[PDB]
């Protein structure tokens, strides 16, 4: 469930 970076 790896999320992409947004910060």
């Amino acid at each position, epitope marked *: *469930d*790896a*999320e*992409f*970076r*947004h*910060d």
Partner: antibody, heavy 118, light 113 residues
Framework: QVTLKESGPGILKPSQTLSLTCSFS??????????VGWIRQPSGLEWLAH???????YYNPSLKSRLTISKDTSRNQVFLKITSVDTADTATYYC????????????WGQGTTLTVSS | DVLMTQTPLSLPVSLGDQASISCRSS???????????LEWYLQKPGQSPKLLIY???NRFSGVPDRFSGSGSGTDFTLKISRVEAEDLGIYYC?????????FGAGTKLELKG
């Protein structure tokens, strides 16, 4: 004015390593919040890998074993390597930018065409 | 991977018609930070894709107001209020919440004859 420009070898033989470079102007990868990714369009669109101002790297898991992304902020360039190419890697390769304050692919390169063939 | 399913894959229209394209994701595009990173791109013949909409419904600067995006969770729509000839091309939805970042297959907006 922000621009990105991809360069590659044009043609490679199966089993060779693809070396792509993205050169850019009008911004710097050293800037906090900056990132650049690679997307290709095989003979729809497929995202490959992505790198951030702080050297954080993201890869498409199905392709990870063949991919390596890196940067040289001084040269203001980003690099992608794809090992062991085969005919399915024939595609147009794009680089595209995102930033934490404009978090979307607003700026793309024109693309570099690669043909892998014996 | 998050599968992005566009319906229809081919959309014949007459100039001036309203047009709508569905994008359904296999999982919610809501990110842990609360934003939904759903983008829409248009690719014209001999061009790189161009950004139309980001975060579901925010129109990118310079994009004509006949374009709009809506939806939430797993269900998204791109709407063109009146189709102009320059709008013909391939439309892609794209999610950047989850790795790998994934595009829909492309919907070709084409002319009725």
């Amino acid at each position: 004015q922000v621009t990105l420009k991809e360069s590659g070898p044009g043609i490679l033989k199966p089993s060779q390593t693809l070396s792509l470079t993205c050169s850019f102007s009008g911004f710097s990868l050293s800037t906090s919040g900056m990132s650049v990714g690679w997307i290709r369009q095989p003979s729809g669109l497929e995202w490959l890998a992505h790198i951030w101002w702080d050297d954080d790297k993201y890869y498409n898991p199905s392709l990870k074993s063949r991919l390596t992304i890196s940067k040289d902020t001084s040269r203001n360039q980003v690099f992608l390597k794809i090992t062991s190419v085969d005919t399915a890697d024939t595609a147009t390769y794009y680089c595209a930018r995102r930033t934490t304050t404009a978090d979307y692919f607003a700026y793309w390169g024109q693309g570099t065409t690669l043909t892998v063939s014996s | 991977d998050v599968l992005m399913t566009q319906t229809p894959l081919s959309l014949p229209v007459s100039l001036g018609d309203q047009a709508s394209i569905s994008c359904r994701s296999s999982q919610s595009i809501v990110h842990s930070n609360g934003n939904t990173y759903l983008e829409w791109y248009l690719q014209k013949p001999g061009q790189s894709p161009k950004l139309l909409i980001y975060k579901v419904s925010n129109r990118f600067s310079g994009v004509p107001d006949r374009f709009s995006g809506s939806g939430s969770g797993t269900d998204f729509t791109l709407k063109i209020s009146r189709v102009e000839a320059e709008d013909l091309g391939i439309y892609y939805c794209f999610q950047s919440s989850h790795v790998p970042l994934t595009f829909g297959a492309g919907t070709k907006l084409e002319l009725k004859g």
